[PDB]
């Protein structure tokens, strides 16, 4: 079968905006758009990195009042006291926080941590940045 | 609050690969991952419409004992007090420092800052991460 | 710029002890040390006149897996978005975290924040450091 | 001799303010005031601490455009990459910066670093905070 069809649920608001945009862009339907987002994702998450020694920053944005992301983030970070040096936190508003986490370790292990972070429920957005000093 | 449920048709091999990956990474479900994609998509767009508060983080690596970079950076940064919130600094070794600046303001402005910083002769590495301020996400 | 030179008479044994100490510490001269004292003196006073922008840093240590502290702290902090600039966090070990909040605003306000934070059942240690914003120093 | 008399130079502005204050307070002359400041200083810098293991924060405020404090601070911090974990820097205005430095080490060695910092010319003010986790 060339196409697998499925459903996903999204908050009305977040959907309204996504729709307004893919409309400006000229997409005919949501499937084309999401398809591309997935394509681009699959690519960026295949640029496999070895086991070098790197220094990075994991920037994240989340709602501290949502689910239990606040603790999941702390518990998860304390698991790696060796790769995680420090973290800068800026309170964006009543609910949202922006956190930058500085790390150093095996480029492969660092990427694993960043992903375990960005994937937690409650983390709205974020990006990893690695660099060999 | 109101949840809308909609269906989409994705290329089976593309989807199979997607699912395969989100598992490796650690996403619990595909929905979450797709919402993140959409959220990210909306956030990138948020930056394309030059006017509207956004947040970002300029990460840079440099040798402080080289050129004038140390000062050059501060002057530049102090030239943008309203956009820069605060920066974190880690001393990598005897010569190299890793710094991560946190910015908030108009997208265009922030891009100009990152440009001025990253183009500094003394900055060996550096990336600007365009993220959000949360105010309009979910 | 205008430098004023003035003379003072200090108890010889007190001075001898002062000099002895600033050497241990590392001050190059007594003048510098005395200027710092005066600067500090002016800064403390700056806090006693409840109205005028000042800066400070609330340092706290706690166990995140204890009580509700982790959340309690954020709520408190998010209740003061205009005074709190950003905080730095270091994971001491498997259970304890060290956090240093940076604040800027009216002295009274800042003292109230430090009070609300430090009195939190879960905060084991913590000090508020009243410093300056530089705007009126030299 | 019970009293040693000496001169010190201060920027007119900084002196104007110091004077206005010691006047409100009721000091008869600048020597009484400075005397006390020195007394209080000598006390706080005698509470000798052993060689325990502590975690601290050194908060400093300085004019990055003054002398060469910016480099003196960096060079001096890179000497101790073991006790100095990270540092948060906030640009206060055109010239002034506020920096918080997080440290961990032998309470005795930490106090030595903090003092070498606060004493550098260009550092307008600051305080150390140690605590045994
Ligand atoms: Ni935990
Ligand atoms: Ni927050
Ligand atoms: Ni997520
Ligand atoms: Ni400057
Ligand atoms: Ni450094
Ligand atoms: Ni809350
Ligand atoms: Ni922690
Ligand atoms: Ni150096
Ligand atoms: Ni600065
Ligand atoms: Ni000084």
Q: Shortest Cα distance from D89 to chain A (angstroms)?
A: 10
Instruction: Please give the method by which this entry was determined.
Output: X-ray
CA A100, A105, A110, A113 torsion-angle sign: negative
Question: What are the b/e assignments for C104-128, b being 16+ CB within 10 Å?
Answer: bbebebbbebbebbeebebbbbbbb
| CA–CA distance, C22 with C72 (Å, rounded to integer) | 42
| CA–CA distance, C110 with B76 (Å, rounded to integer) | 29
**Residue with the two structure tokens 């009216």:** C106
Rg (CA), chain B: 19
User: D85: which chain A residues are within 8 Å (Cβ-Cβ)?
Assistant: 85-86
Q: Which is it for strands A3-11 and B3-11: parallel, antiparallel or unpaired?
A: antiparallel
Which of B4, B28, B131 faces A127 most closely, judged by CB atoms? Answer: B131
D45 annotated as belonging to a binding site for a ligand:
no
> Taking the domains of chain B in order of start, what are their residue ranges?
11-50, 51-138
Cα of B83 vs centre of ligand 4, distance in Å, is 17
Contact B98, B59 (CB under 8 A): yes
Q: Residue A107: count other Cβ atoms within 10 Å of its Cβ.
A: 19
CA atoms within 13 A on the CB side of A18: 25
| CA–CA distance, D13 with A102 (Å, rounded to integer) | 41
The Cα-based distances of B129 to B51, B84, B102 in angstroms read 17, 14, 10
- Contacting partners of chain C (3+ CB pairs under 8 A): A, B, D
| CA–CA distance, A32 with B8 (Å, rounded to integer) | 9
Secondary structure of C11-66 in HEC code, one letter for each residue: EHHHHHHHHHHHHHHCCCCHHHHHHHHHHHHHHHHHHHCCCCEEEEEEEEEEECCC
Domains A10-50 and A51-133 in one fold: no
What's phi and psi for A111, nearest 5 deg? -60, -35
Contact B26, A115 (CB under 8 A): yes
CA B14, B20, B25, B27 torsion-angle sign: positive
Question: What are the b/e assignments for B9-46, b being 16+ CB within 10 Å?
Answer: bbbeebbebbeebbeebebeebebbbbbbbbbbbbebb
Contact A103, D87 (CB under 8 A): no
Structure tokens at B106: 């108009």
Residues 6+ away with beta carbon under 8 Å from C15:
D4, D38
Residue C119: its H or E element: none
| CA–CA distance, D92 with D105 (Å, rounded to integer) | 29
**Residue with the two structure tokens 């996400």:** B137
What's phi and psi for A73, nearest 5 deg? -70, -45
Q: Shortest Cα distance from B81 to chain A (angstroms)?
A: 16
Query: Quick one: which of A86, C27, A100, C85 has its CA closest to D104?
Result: A86
User: B37: which chain A residues are within 8 Å (Cβ-Cβ)?
Assistant: 34, 37-38, 41
What residues of chain D, 8 to 67, have a C-beta less than 8 Å from chain C? 8-15, 17-18, 21, 30-31, 33-35, 37-39, 41-42, 45-46, 55-57, 59, 61-63
CA A58, A62, A67, A68 torsion-angle sign: positive
Span A10-50 CATH architecture: Orthogonal Bundle (1.10)
Q: Which is it for strands C96-106 and D96-106: parallel, antiparallel or unpaired?
A: unpaired
Query: Quick one: which of D57, D77, D66, D85 has its CA closest to D117?
Result: D77
Residues 6+ away with beta carbon under 8 Å from D105:
D53, D54, D82, D83
User: C65: which chain A residues are within 8 Å (Cβ-Cβ)?
Assistant: 75
Query: Quick one: which of D109, B11, D120, B117 has its CA closest to A35?
Result: B11
Query: Quick one: which of A84, A75, A78, A73 has its CA closest to A120?
Result: A73
Query: Quick one: which of D90, D96, B134 has its CA closest to C86?
Result: D90
D26: left (phi over 0), alpha (psi -120 to 50) or beta: left
Give the chain C residue nearest B86 (alpha carbons).
C86
Contact D60, D126 (CB under 8 A): yes
Q: Which is it for strands B53-63 and B96-106: parallel, antiparallel or unpaired?
A: antiparallel
User: D96: which chain C residues are within 8 Å (Cβ-Cβ)?
Assistant: 133-135, 137
Give the chain D residue nearest A101 (alpha carbons).
D86
| CA–CA distance, B29 with B45 (Å, rounded to integer) | 25
Residues 6+ away with beta carbon under 8 Å from C41:
D18, D21, D33, D37
Query: What does this entry list as its resolution, in Å?
Result: 3.0
Residues with Cβ–ion distance below 5 A, ligand 5: B 91, 97
Q: Shortest Cα distance from A76 to chain C (angstroms)?
A: 10
> What is the DSSP annotation of B50-118?
S-SEEEEEEEEEEETTSSSHHHHHHHHHHTTTTTEEEEEEEE-SSSEEEEEEEEEEEHHHHHHHHHHHH
Burial of residue D129 (number of CB atoms within 10 Å: 0-12, 13-18, 19+):
buried
Q: What is the DSSP letter of D80?
A: T
Domain B11-50: top CATH class: mainly alpha
Contact B91 D75 (CB under 8 A): no
Q: Shortest Cα distance from C91 to chain D (angstroms)?
A: 11
| CA–CA distance, B121 with B68 (Å, rounded to integer) | 9
Query: Quick one: which of A28, A55, A46 has its CA closest to A131?
Result: A55
Query: Quick one: which of B67, B39, B41, B43 has its CA closest to B53?
Result: B43
Query: What's the CA angle centered on B46, arms B44 and B50, to 5 degrees?
Result: 115
Burial of residue D121 (number of CB atoms within 10 Å: 0-12, 13-18, 19+):
middle
Burial of residue C133 (number of CB atoms within 10 Å: 0-12, 13-18, 19+):
buried
**Residue with the two structure tokens 């998010």:** C78
- Contacting partners of chain B (3+ CB pairs under 8 A): A, C, D
Structure tokens at B4: 């809308």
* C51-138: CATH, from 3.30.70.1150, 3.40.50.11540, 3.60.15.10, 1.10.10.60: 3.30.70.1150
Query: What's the CA angle centered on B115, arms B111 and B117, to 5 degrees?
Result: 120
**Residue with the two structure tokens 């910092």:** D117
User: Listing from the earlier edge strand, what are the strands of the sheet with C123-131?
Assistant: A123-131, A53-63, A96-106, A84-91, C84-91, C96-106, C53-63, C123-131
Query: Quick one: which of B58, B57, B63, B77 has its CA closest to B121?
Result: B63
Residues 6+ away with beta carbon under 8 Å from C117:
C58, C60, C73, C76, C77, C101, C123, C126
Q: What is the DSSP letter of A81?
A: T
Q: Which fold has domain D51-133?
A: Alpha-Beta Plaits (3.30.70)
| CA–CA distance, A62 with A74 (Å, rounded to integer) | 13
The SS3 call for residue A68 is coil
């Amino acid at each position: 079968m060339e196409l697998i069809r499925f459903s996903i649920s999204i908050p009305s608001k977040l959907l309204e905006k996504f729709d307004q945009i893919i409309e400006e862009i000229g997409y005919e339907n949501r499937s084309e758009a999401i398809r591309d987002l997935i394509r681009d994702f699959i690519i960026r998450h295949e640029w496999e990195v070895g086991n070098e020694e790197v220094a990075g920053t994991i920037t994240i944005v989340y709602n501290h009042d949502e689910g239990d992301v606040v603790k999941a983030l702390l518990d998860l970070q304390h698991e790696y006291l060796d790769e995680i040096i420090s973290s800068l936190h800026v309170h964006m508003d009543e609910h949202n926080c922006l956190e930058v986490i500085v790390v150093k370790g095996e480029a492969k292990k660092i990427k694993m941590i960043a992903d375990k972070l960005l994937s937690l429920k409650g983390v709205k957005h974020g990006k990893l940045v690695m660099t060999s000093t």
